[PDB]
């Protein structure tokens, strides 16, 4: 009752994708696993602007394709998008065979998807934000079909500096990937996301933020903070606003203390190495940013330092520092 999906880390911790087999006999698709959205969409032979490197779903080549035909369309926070028509087919996730999952066949996708590593996305948010109302998500179906007993998935995202990788376990979790005991944290799923409250953020002995809300989003690269929190964190590290939602920060992290979040009475950090996301031409971009959101998007900068068990049933999460 447990599905294991080894992940690939794209570049410098940009995103984490895993293979999913769709159809009968089945084609293998590389999908970005995204707790910030709830649509499972794939490049298809109906697509008019997809990429030559992508695997394309062909309805005629699956014995278990079920027609649906309703339109779907999604737009993501980074400006990427896709759209097309619905269908149903069997979806094998780490060995667990979901029967008749609603899949979303792309007729169009943004150029960034056509030039990227993904054949599509696997949405792991809550079903109240599927772009077509009433679509049941993969986790909904794993639960309702009895393919997993525990309504959970455990998430390890690797660091490119350690060789990359990552691993999702559907129906369980992997204790070899984290330190100490898991801490339970309640989830607010009212906007479709894995919402939490951070009671306080600190750098060393200094408070850099009082309470703020955020979402645990495997499909966002950075730790995106409200502008005032972002600006306070930047001040703590001497970082300079690039005007585009990112900061320039020193490439030498040896004298940086971790950024520590207090969450439900326990501490979870961004490690000092992770305070740098990217180096280009001698300049470093910070692992935290801003985006004019009233809540934080707690993305890969944080998640690659903190193992999370996502529990859809409660809903709640359990968090522990990664073993590293």
């Amino acid at each position: 009752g447990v599905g294991t999906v080894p992940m690939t880390d794209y570049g410098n911790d940009i995103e984490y994708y895993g293979q999913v087999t769709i159809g009968t006999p089945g084609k293998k698709f590389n999908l970005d696993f995204d707790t910030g959205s709830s649509d499972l969409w794939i490049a298809s032979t109906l697509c008019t602007n997809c990429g030559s490197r992508q695997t394309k779903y062909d309805p005629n080549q699956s014995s278990t394709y079920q027609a649906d035909g309703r339109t779907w369309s999604i737009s993501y926070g980074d400006g990427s998008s896709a759209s097309g028509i619905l269908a149903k087919d069997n979806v094998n996730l780490g060995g667990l065979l979901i029967k008749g999952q609603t899949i979303e066949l792309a007729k169009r996708e943004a150029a960034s998807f056509a030039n990227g590593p993904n054949d599509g996305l696997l949405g792991l948010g809550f079903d109240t934000i599927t772009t077509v109302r009433g679509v049941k998500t993969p986790m909904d179906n794993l639960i309702s079909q009895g393919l997993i007993s525990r309504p959970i998935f455990g998430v390890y995202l690797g660091k490119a500096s350690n060789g990359g990788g990552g691993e999702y376990i559907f129906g369980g979790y992997d204790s070899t990937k984290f330190k100490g005991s898991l801490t339970t944290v309640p989830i607010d799923n009212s906007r479709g996301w894995w919402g939490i409250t951070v009671d306080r953020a600190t750098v060393g002995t200094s408070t850099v933020a009082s309470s703020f809300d955020g979402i645990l989003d495997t499909g966002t690269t950075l730790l995106i903070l409200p502008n005032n929190v972002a600006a306070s964190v930047a001040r703590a590290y001497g970082a300079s606003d690039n005007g585009d939602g990112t900061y320039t920060i020193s490439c030498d992290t040896s004298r940086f203390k971790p950024l520590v979040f207090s969450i439900n009475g326990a501490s979870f950090q961004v490690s000092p190495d992770s305070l740098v996301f990217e180096e280009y031409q001698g300049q470093c971009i910070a692992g935290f940013g801003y985006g004019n959101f009233d809540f934080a998007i707690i993305g890969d900068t944080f998640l690659k330092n903190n193992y999370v068990v996502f529990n859809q049933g409660v809903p709640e999460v359990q968090i522990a520092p990664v073993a590293e």
């Binding site: 926070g77 980074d78 690269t221 950075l222």
Partner: peptide, 4 residues
């Protein structure tokens, strides 16, 4: 970065 991505924001999805």
């Amino acid at each position: 970065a991505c924001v999805k």
